[PDB]
């Protein structure tokens, strides 16, 4: 048969600074979809909205619903765009669900809204997409051009960066 | 792991300030990426890749061999990216390196460019893939020996 | 002599949505300076900072100070970038200063920060620069591709537009 | 006053597919300008202005004459903007209109372009200047009969 390009990555959007839209800022349409629109993909990426909340407003119940959506996807490569304030809490929660054992689940986002000049967003999305495809099964944070183990990571609010504990 | 980036020109770096090859766009993207790790950028060429000769490819291969880093990104034009990747794939000196070639179909300084996404994807690939030579474009990893540029499609494709 | 390009326009910056930047957004460096940097001007434009306040927070005293900077300029063509929330109050105040009688003074700004995609800012700066050069002496607001008389204008916060009192 | 905008191509409108002339950039700028007044945009040409003949200039003159509006902006390439402007300045049919020509030295779809600024400036000029034909570029108003394009300066300059 003629070659069929697969679509092995599914993306979930859960809000955050990456998606803030001043058109100060509040959470608008997912910025990840703008980046993939112009990525000239060989395949395609299904993109599904889970939430538009600021990550500091996430409850235990919000994390559980995200775990259930991730767990029910047919894809084994998952990228979750999210705010950076509670990305570590969501990542640690997902890491303790056995329903995710066979999946590579990467969380990412941006410190500068994608719709603001000089944003890290487009770089981070490309980096995180590749990380979701290439890393062994597990839950990871992809930021600053590297991979973080959620159990050994914290968000430094002052410096706007993830760092090792 | 420490990453070394080489720039050999191409559409990704075309500037209009038609277009012609300007300063490497990858340096603009990495500047706002807020990187944690060791990364350095080295300029090799501003040629349009259609003009690359066998001697240009051999010079690229020796330059990549000068890097002690084992994770390499080369930004390049798409017209002869496959020829450079296949040549590099046959150099025994590079056998322990992960070498990824990437670029852009639209200049990074033009609106709606794939460049920033491609640079992020390619940086991860150069850090995560096993030793070998790869093209990272269109959100996937190509094997150079089994890839061509399909000008009809506007994409790299498997042979 | 070899021709000398004049610099007949002076720009003052007083903050506003036009200048908001990520650090939500807050008032950063003047966006008007980024627009003029790439405008390939034949002349130049002297750009002076007066304030980084959100315009809601401007007092009687803030307006009086802006009136003094504008009045002491040598140039007779002046653009003031400003927040839109109290642009009408500033414009009305300047309109009552006899020291500005021979000057063309235009206020402008943006409803979307210049550093955000799909901003009105660069258009508004070009339109307002031309308005400051070409209108008769007076005080005006240049927004939405037109010229408003501050005495007959209000900001519609709800609608995001300047409009007449008709 | 109602403004009519004509697009005749030029660097301002060049897009990636080097660059070639694409959809009018003026329509992208006016879409986000939150305009209060009446403005309409009409496409005339996508030529590079070096290729315009005396017949092309005469066609542009009659198109401008078809507008009932008295305030006109024409976006154009800079290579023969002076030739078009001088030609229009000699048409008695246009004597009651304010006709402003503008464009950009960098395409509007390229980073660090003069285009958006030039469009705002030129729209104001078309609304505010006395009847006549003008070039609005570099934040000033040029008299076409006393203007040249100085490729050495990269600016229009007075004679």
Residue numbers in the entry:
A (entry chain A): 0 to 22, 27 to 168
B (entry chain B), D (entry chain C): 6 to 22, 27 to 168
C (entry chain D): 0 to 22, 27 to 169
Give me lines lifted from the publication on this model:
In contrast, the chain of ASNase from Rhodospirillum rubrum, reported here and referred to as RrA, consists of only 172 amino acid residues.
RrA(Y21A) without added L‐Asp was disordered in the region of residues 22–26 and the active site contained a mostly disordered HEPES molecule contributed by the buffer. Solvent molecules occupied the space where the Tyr side chain is present in RrA(wt). In some cases, orthorhombic crystals with a doubled c axis were obtained, belonging to space group P212121. In this role, substituting Tyr with Phe preserves this role better than the mutation Tyr → Ala.
